[PDB]
Structure 1
Amino acid sequence: APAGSHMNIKELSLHELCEELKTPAWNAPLTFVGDVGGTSARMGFVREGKNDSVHACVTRYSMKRKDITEIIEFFNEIIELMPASVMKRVKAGVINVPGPVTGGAVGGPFNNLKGIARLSDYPKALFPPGHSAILNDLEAGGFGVLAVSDAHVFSEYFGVMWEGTQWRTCEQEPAGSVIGRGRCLVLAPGTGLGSSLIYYNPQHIVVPLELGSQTLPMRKDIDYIQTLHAELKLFPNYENMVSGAGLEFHYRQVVRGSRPPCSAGEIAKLASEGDANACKAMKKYHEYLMRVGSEASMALLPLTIVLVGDNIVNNAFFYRNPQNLKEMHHEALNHEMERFGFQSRVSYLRQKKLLNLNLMGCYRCGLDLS
């Protein structure tokens, strides 16, 4: 019932997408959107239905050549098919990319993609000047988190891990029910570690960050961090510990050549099945994710930290174990500033139902942009 709460995202073949857009229901203003990641991209169009409902259909391309410029071919092969009837309806064009974006127009460099995303190189049919942008992925995600809060459906998609000291101080509503009137640190651990701060005051503004790339501070783990360092030939950062390659590293350190190396996916799958080794590796992954959160808790003074992404949803098992959850909490407050209770001010929440926040975010940004 609540306005904006119906959010449908359907993935189709390019042909099916094209046929879908010819149906009478899609004779409306179109926003082109693209959630471009390291390995795949979902590109498509979004319209607003009845009851402020959000209707999206996208096609997934593979980022095989690992080159952010590749997507220009995608845009072009899309413009190749679609009828003029459809193309005239495009009112805005917004994409997100997995790297730092400046001026909303130049993205990169990327850790795992070649090149630089350039809005000025994109086809104006999909990217109308004055109504177009490149967002960073977690910037897109933050607009998405905002959109979900505005559609009154926050507790449908996010679960409370633990409510911090400060929420009671400034919120009339229950935690997890709305984004809240306070800063929101949005974290997404996957291939990389994304972070964005939704800042609030006289009201919500999404500010892109790169916390993952900060040098990782040693606590009582000089040896662990020096092992990774000799492997990477670099001073480890947070992402090195909290990413796919991170989880794989933790797993290797646990088994010590007693079992074959597994991918991030395999390790998590093993953990969901109660494998001791994989569970140990997941705890370490999560120990360092709580270190990201403890320091950002100090540095950014957020009201809430919200963990997002398919990996979070899919890892629900890890978070629902009350023992895992107690130890993460303990880790989240393991900072010298906690003596003043800064780490305990913060409420942690985790995405609990699947939803492409990034596309919701491009669409929303696309509204603002026209």
Structure 2
Amino acid sequence: MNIKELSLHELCEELKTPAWNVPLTFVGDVGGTSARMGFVREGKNDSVHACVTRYSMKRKDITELIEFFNEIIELMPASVIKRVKAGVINVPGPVTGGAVGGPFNNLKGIARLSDYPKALFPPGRSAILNDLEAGGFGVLAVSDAHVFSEYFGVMWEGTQWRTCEQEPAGSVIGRGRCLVLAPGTGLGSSLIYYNPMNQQHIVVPLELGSQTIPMRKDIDYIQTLHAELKLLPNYENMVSGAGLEFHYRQVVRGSRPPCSAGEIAKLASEGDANACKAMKKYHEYLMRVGSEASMALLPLTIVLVGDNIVNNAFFYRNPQNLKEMHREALNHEMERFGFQSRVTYLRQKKLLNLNLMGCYRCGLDLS
């Protein structure tokens, strides 16, 4: 279970070692700021090994990936380019058919698997994933690698865990639906559906973040944001970089100049009461995605993934914040039946690019 980040040149060098003679999967984790492309292999002992290289989404244009793909094949021995079983990339948007991606909120243009090289993307063994679909696949990879507890911690157990499972919560993904949320630049969601007929997990990409926020007792707070965006706020408007910034502005009341999402998180890590309140506010709305999705989708587990999540561990480690989140997760009318208390919440507690493992894990199903 491991990935080594390299420059394009050291990548080429590495790709000639005797360890990298096995058949290979081309993977790419594309974001709105940067992309990470490279190759994955199993070596020995059920171990996953990848080395990738970072590219900057400079033009901020999804089609720039075509360029990078070329730049790889040219500058690389075709005694390696031939060992390519499958090509799988993820992109930060809705993907249709596994072959067309867009429109994007970060970028412009459309991801088209047809306009991709076939040395990197062998026909019938190639897919374009939504990033959180790749992440879901990754979550599945972590479970099959028997290492779930190493990357995910329980935030609190739901009622339904012990009725489906004898193992401790956090030790396995569990024979139930698992909803994956990624609160980052944007707000990513996917549902790892569980088919009880055949006991199979299947990743279903979702756009939970773009739904209109339903109310609680916060009609005014929503209205304030509504008036800034000229749009009915959706969850992502409240749970995202711009959302955290918004919450900070509402907290200070102009008495401090606006600072960035990242900076707000730093301040909270440093104990700043204003930032900290902004963080709590952000998490109040994350937990609303949770309680609504818990009803609609009935998951056995909800899992919070991403580097944001791992890095903000100072926040989840605090049991007062955790109880307030727990409180808000149950703040749904249907809780009087226990529907929100069914669910187990976990969070990623250790850095791992779930999307990269996801692309490779998906590559297996294609071949």
* RMSD of aligned residue pairs (Cα, Å): 0.7
Q: 2:153 aligns with which of 146, 159, 170?
A: 159
CA-CA distance at 1:218 after TM superposition: 1.7
Cα shift readout 1:120-165 (whole Å, capped 9, x = no counterpart): 0001110000100000001000010001011110000000000001
Greater mean deviation of Cα atoms: 132-141 or 257-266: 257-266
What pairs with 1:194-343 in structure 2 (closer than 5 Å)?
A: 194-202=188-196, 203-343=200-340
Between the aligned partners of 1:187 and 1:282, the Cα distance in structure 2 is 17
CA-CA distance at 1:72 after TM superposition: 0.7
CA-CA distance at 1:87 after TM superposition: 0.6
Between the aligned partners of 1:302 and 1:8, the Cα distance in structure 2 is 29
Between the aligned partners of 2:320 and 2:85, the Cα distance in structure 1 is 50
Cα shift readout 1:221-240 (whole Å, capped 9, x = no counterpart): 11111111111111110001
CA-CA distance at 1:212 after TM superposition: 0.4
Specify every segment of 5 or more residues in structure 2 that has no aligned partner in the other structure, as ranges: none
Greater mean deviation of Cα atoms: 104-113 or 302-311: 104-113
Aligned residues between the structures? 364
CA-CA distance at 1:354 after TM superposition: 0.4
Between the aligned partners of 1:187 and 1:223, the Cα distance in structure 2 is 26
Between the aligned partners of 2:28 and 2:92, the Cα distance in structure 1 is 12
Give the percent of matched residue pairs that are identical in Structure 1 and Structure 2.
98
Cα shift readout 1:231-283 (whole Å, capped 9, x = no counterpart): 11111100010011110111111112111211111111110111000000000
CA-CA distance at 1:23 after TM superposition: 1.3
Between the aligned partners of 1:249 and 1:18, the Cα distance in structure 2 is 44
Cα shift readout 1:278-312 (whole Å, capped 9, x = no counterpart): 00000000000000000000000000000000000
Between the aligned partners of 2:96 and 2:317, the Cα distance in structure 1 is 38
Between the aligned partners of 1:8 and 1:201, the Cα distance in structure 2 is 29
Between the aligned partners of 2:14 and 2:294, the Cα distance in structure 1 is 45
Between the aligned partners of 1:25 and 1:195, the Cα distance in structure 2 is 36
Q: Secondary structure at the match of 1:19?
A: helix
CA-CA distance at 1:79 after TM superposition: 1.1
Greater mean deviation of Cα atoms: 64-73 or 180-189: 64-73
CA-CA distance at 1:327 after TM superposition: 0.4
User: Once superposed, which parts of structure 1, at least 4 consecutive aligned residues long, lie more than 4 Å away?
Assistant: none
Between the aligned partners of 2:244 and 2:82, the Cα distance in structure 1 is 46
Q: Secondary structure at the match of 1:345?
A: coil
Between the aligned partners of 2:106 and 2:60, the Cα distance in structure 1 is 7
CA-CA distance at 1:63 after TM superposition: 0.8
CA-CA distance at 1:24 after TM superposition: 1.4
TM superposition score normalised by structure 1: 0.97
Between the aligned partners of 1:315 and 1:13, the Cα distance in structure 2 is 28
CA-CA distance at 1:65 after TM superposition: 1.3
Cα shift readout 1:66-114 (whole Å, capped 9, x = no counterpart): 1111111111111120111111111100000111111100111111110
